Write a protein that binds this ligand. Sequence first.
Ligand code: LFK
Ligand code: LFK
Ligand code: ZN
Ligand code: ZN
Lengths: 494, 495
Amino acid sequence: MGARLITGGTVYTADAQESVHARGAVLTVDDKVVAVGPAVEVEQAVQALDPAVRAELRRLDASRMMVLPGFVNAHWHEMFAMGFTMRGALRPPSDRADQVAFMGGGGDMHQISATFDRFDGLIEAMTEDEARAIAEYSMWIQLRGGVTTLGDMGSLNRPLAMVEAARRLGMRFSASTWASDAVLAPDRSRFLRTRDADTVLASFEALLGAVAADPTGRIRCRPNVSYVTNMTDELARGMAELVERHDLPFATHVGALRNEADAMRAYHGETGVRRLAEAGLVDERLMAGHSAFLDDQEQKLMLAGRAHISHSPGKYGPSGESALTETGVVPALRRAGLDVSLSTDAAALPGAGIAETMRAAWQMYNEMSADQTEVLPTDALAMATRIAAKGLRWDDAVGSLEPGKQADLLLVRTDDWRYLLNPRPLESFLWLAGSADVDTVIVGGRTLVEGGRGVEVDEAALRDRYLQALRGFTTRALRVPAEAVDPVLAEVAR
Amino acid sequence: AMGARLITGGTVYTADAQESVHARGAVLTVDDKVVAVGPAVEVEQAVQALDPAVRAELRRLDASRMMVLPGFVNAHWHEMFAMGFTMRGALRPPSDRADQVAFMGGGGDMHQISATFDRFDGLIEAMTEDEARAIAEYSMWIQLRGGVTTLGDMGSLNRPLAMVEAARRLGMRFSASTWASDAVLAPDRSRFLRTRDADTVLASFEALLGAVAADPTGRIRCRPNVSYVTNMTDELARGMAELVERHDLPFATHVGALRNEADAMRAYHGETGVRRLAEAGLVDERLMAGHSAFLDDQEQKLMLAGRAHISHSPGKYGPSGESALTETGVVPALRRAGLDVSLSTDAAALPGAGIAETMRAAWQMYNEMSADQTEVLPTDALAMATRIAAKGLRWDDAVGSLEPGKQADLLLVRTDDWRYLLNPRPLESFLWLAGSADVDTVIVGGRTLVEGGRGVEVDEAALRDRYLQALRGFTTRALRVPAEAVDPVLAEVAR
Ligand SMILES: O=C(O)c1cccc(OC(=O)c2cccc(O)c2)c1
Ligand SMILES: O=C(O)c1cccc(OC(=O)c2cccc(O)c2)c1
Ligand SMILES: [Zn+2]
Ligand SMILES: [Zn+2]
């Protein structure tokens, strides 16, 4: 790949000092950052290279650009196979008849639990070709929005199809498997066990074996539990044993909804964080999704364990979640020194990206505390890069522009009205820009997106295979009639 | 401009009384008015019913790869681009690490807010007529570029007639105002100073009203504001009540905006802001109250009983350190109780959240606080930025919805990229993943002003460069910022 100097822009590093450099530069050799700082300081690193390396150095003039570390979306679900349902493409254009459903109104816990237990049967119904075409397009949308490292916390897709998608696209991916072995059946006053814990844990072991073979360093894996509602004691302890043995991170959704604690006490006899604590899962390895509905003891367990919270303040309103303001626990735990990162959660059609989530945190944390300094723009960036990489246990290699780390970075144009005269283009980016304003995406020194276009992939072809795969999956497996699907596909703007 | 236009095939959001949405809908316009709106095939019947002369010169715009919205009505805005080259804007270090809670943050520094607002008159006088017009036209262009077709001044650091001229040149609609402060809180004196004759402040608004009446385009109205209830004597409040009754006008102010406001109002004026307004007879259907979140039960009941209007800016509270959404939850609660609530951008000295960003904010933030994805539907957020804002501005006679007899003010947004694919609700995708810059076409009174994201009736490079020269002149001569601090920033501008 050789050496490149990216010079002249404002450079955000998201290093320990959250360093920003006006007229900064980044020097990369092959897959790694070697120098980053003021342009003159970096130019000295250039004149210190082996003369052979310096001979083929490529200069990128970024003087009309902002440079960011690649986004690390550590809490994501591939759900594009469900695009053609009454959460997506089949809805009437009018939203007036919409109802509080699913996650809304505190959470319909029976429906959420029953829904999650059905994923295994639908993943099974999917062809490898459908899986790969849907995964590839879904993951392209993440990449297009500046996500260079993506974290699977449970997808309706085939794990090895998602690994193949990451490999073809050139991005980094923490692969997972679906884990559900319990359901909250309304005809019972105790959890119904739905699967052998050993089978669920064997699926993840098989994925871990396959990713171990990968030589690129771009593929890792992390076991998840779908949701603590759908987790037996045997699955929780099996997960604790598996992450200790293989030295892995661990992720689940816990304290996510108002109605969760009550359903957890009724069906399992104990709240989410306490059941994880009893299995030994509340430690530095834990990424807890949402994690807002925590009492005093559960908050103290997370803080003592130096656990990690992934927060999705961009997504809550449209799902009817209340995981920011109803408790205010996640901002309080961040203030008390808990690691808190920003993530986009699940989407069956494109929803808020990392850029949109960064804006949401900036506006929403600061409004609740009447304090424009609680989340600075650089904090929002750190929360979407270095701090997310830490929660994913990938901060050895990604999440900041420092010497020795991977050359994963974004260029954003700053030459329009939105940015004019602002010495803080990241602030203009949070006010008035988002995912589609990502211009260039580089992963380990390779240009994957440029001018907001795929460089080595045909996004028109990725789209057409996705639509073909989605048609097959939607008509066959979801039994949606062709009369509802084919008209919508016919009016897709080619 | 004159002539007939059929905009057909896109998804059309009307923001009419039913919040109607038409997939493969159409808008037929003749001269400056909407004549028909609905399903393509039904509008095509209205086309076949036109005078053959009119039909002959019809221009058909294929909008099949677009979303059609009403023009955004930003009814609560301040022109502050003259202050771009201060420590709120261009002179800040790139690093944010040393930023402090200031001004409206931490519940509000009421003395500094009051003192700052009372200095506007002096700084406006320090501005050349050319600087005023150049900064106004660039500031107002930034609004228009993001889809704002009707803009409401609620008190600006600019010359009113410069802003009227800017609106006139740009082709957009403008509710002009004057700056109105006749009191300052002076902690050193244990009282408010009465800094101006209420009757002179009112006579300045009467003179603006005379000048706007001479504008023949129908695009310029005016509305008196009070800067802030801290800076308002009883005599200014009563004079405002008399003026808006005599001329049948709307009225606007900031009230119940900050945690520390109520204590400062009781100490300096005896009474909280909504109570002082109600005593002057200003809490009625004419009132647009900016922020209006720190209200007790009696104040909330006064607003409801008067059918007053609240303009909310949930896009910009966090970055200002304001807490006018969650600390009280009063504005969402008043909306649920039937008060008209609209969405606005407020003040910016450099580009900040536009209407499109504020719609997203309302959709996320109101729905999260109530654990309810239906409290603010995407079509509600649109209504709050169009029809409801028009109603609060008293311009809903002509703007805010795509209905027959209203002005042909509309936006086209392209829906053909990845963000919109397969979504029968392109407005939802727009709130998820788009913003001000994704406005493609802006039509006001049937005239295209923006197309493909570019101004077609202005020189965008001229608006920018004249704004930069004006700001240099104002910054160095009036604000006394040295050339040595200004020219390096201006030298870095990407031309
Ligand atoms: O909505 C989906 O399709 C979906 C798919 C996979 C995982 C998923 O998980 C949560 O987001 C989640 C899970 C529990 C509580 C909560 O408040 C959010 C959701
Ligand atoms: O910030 C500015 O430059 C500015 C300029 C003109 C008016 C203005 O007014 C408010 O938005 C305002 C006024 C009072 C309380 C509040 O919470 C907000 C602010
Ligand atoms: Zn999730
Ligand atoms: Zn204001």
